[PDB]
């Protein structure tokens, strides 16, 4: 845990259906996201932080948590976005004589920042007299080992914890889920999903001179105005499909029951007598 391993996942597609559908995970909590929706999203990158703790410490692995693990071994940001999956590994990480291979930090001058790893093995001074690399009075080794033997309670048994943190940046998405990509449709209202970025609009050919490193553009509203088709490197402008207030021009009900309908600000094609006014 103090030396929690980190892996990077990028430029690939992952089927999370098998992930949250597995019953082998004791704890499965997603913050900022749901297990099901992963297959319908794309992310620039993912970081998998893998480590081992005891059952009681499982709760500590969560945003807004405090404790030895959270403070000294692994801290999550308050705005963390991702999923934590913890499963018992008693059959894998427990030795009959004692599995001392798993360690955790017990002392530190200050709590860890989010996604900060500290692997230093310098003696922790807890007393007036400083420690010149030698233990003794108020001079302790910063790391301690788990027992991890099969005869423990569930709270003390080993659990393998993996945190998948998905980076949702403006850089191009590189991690997507399953789901095939349908053919491109233009000049029609459609629910588009470009690289996990979803929306609704009308897609048209664009003359904008996108730079090679530029995938999509945003307007003053920071809203997706143009995109680059991930399959075909072409620029497509997205425009709002069609919306407008429906009002009713009606003479007094006492007079007549026939009325006309006014669709404000819509062409007379997206909808007897039809009259196109400004």
């Amino acid at each position, epitope marked *: 845990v103090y030396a929690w391993n980190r892996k990077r996942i990028s430029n690939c597609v992952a089927d999370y259906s098998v992930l949250y559908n597995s019953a082998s995970f004791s704890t499965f909590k997603c913050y900022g996201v749901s297990p099901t929706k992963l297959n319908d999203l794309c992310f620039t990158n993912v970081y998998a932080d893998s480590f081992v703790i005891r059952g009681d410490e499982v709760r500590q692995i969560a945003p807004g948590q405090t404790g030895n693990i959270a403070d000294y071994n692994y801290k999550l940001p308050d705005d963390f976005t991702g999923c934590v999956i913890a499963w018992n590994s008693n059959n894998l990480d427990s030795k*009959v*004589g*004692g599995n001392y291979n798993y360690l955790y930090r017990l002392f530190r001058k200050s709590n860890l920042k989010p996604f900060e790893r500290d692997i230093s093995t310098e003696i922790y001074q807890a007393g007036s007299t400083p420690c010149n690399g030698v*233990k003794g009075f108020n001079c302790y080794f910063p790391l301690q080992s788990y*027992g991890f033997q099969p*005869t*423990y309670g569930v709270g003390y048994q080993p659990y393998r914890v993996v945190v998948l943190s998905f980076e949702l940046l403006h850089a191009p998405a590189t991690v997507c889920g399953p789901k095939k990509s349908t053919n491109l449709v233009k000049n029609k209202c459609v629910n588009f999903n470009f690289n996990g970025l979803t929306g609704t609009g009308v897609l048209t050919e664009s003359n904008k001179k996108f730079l090679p490193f530029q995938q999509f553009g945003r307007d003053i509203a920071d809203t997706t105005d143009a995109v680059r088709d991930p399959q075909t490197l072409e620029i497509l402008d997205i425009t709002p499909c069609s919306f407008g207030g429906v009002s009713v021009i009606t003479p007094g009900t006492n007079t007549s029951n026939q009325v006309a309908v006014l669709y404000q600000g819509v062409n007379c094609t997206e909808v007897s007598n039809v009259f196109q006014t400004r």
Partner: antibody
Amino acid sequence: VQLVESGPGLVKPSETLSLTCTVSGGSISSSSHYWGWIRQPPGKGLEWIGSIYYSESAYYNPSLKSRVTMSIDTSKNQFSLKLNSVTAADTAVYYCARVTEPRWTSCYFDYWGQGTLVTVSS
Amino acid sequence: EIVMTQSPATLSLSPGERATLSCRTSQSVTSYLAWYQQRPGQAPRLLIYDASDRATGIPARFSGSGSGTDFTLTISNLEPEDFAVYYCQLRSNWPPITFGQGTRLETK
């Protein structure tokens, strides 16, 4: 619970000393307890030899590990000890005890057996 | 190595007094300790675990000062049948399960 020791009370030097502890107050297949052996020579202190878990594995003393082995039998609900190349310093009373190791360093022998005296001489 | 040292080798007290046995570990780690009682011809009996927890059936007069490096077993009111040999036992990384040299408690 109770533990009862069994085995020859005499072992010639440079020969294997075999002992078998049979429990009857519980179950050895329980996943909460170890089963250990502790010996003491006459008029001397206690010496933990080795502790065995139900599955197969065990851990022994860092001095007698070369010439010591432990075995278990859930069917007969009993665990045995072999001490190879027994010298004259193994003349002692051997107890078999029940061990509970809950956290890390908490390792206490809950209930002891009466123990059997094995004197090794020629 | 984590070496165990009990004190004193022999303790001379009479019934009604209180006894204080010391079990100090080497200048090393600190955690739990077990105290056991052994009378002549009997297997050692568990008195205290986790550095102060009376075993099942231990009178209230037994107690443990579970503190750092050094530990202490205290017997409030010495009864006639409370004079025996007392062993303290640790479980370190290496060697595992170390036993104390034992303290002989006799009637002065």
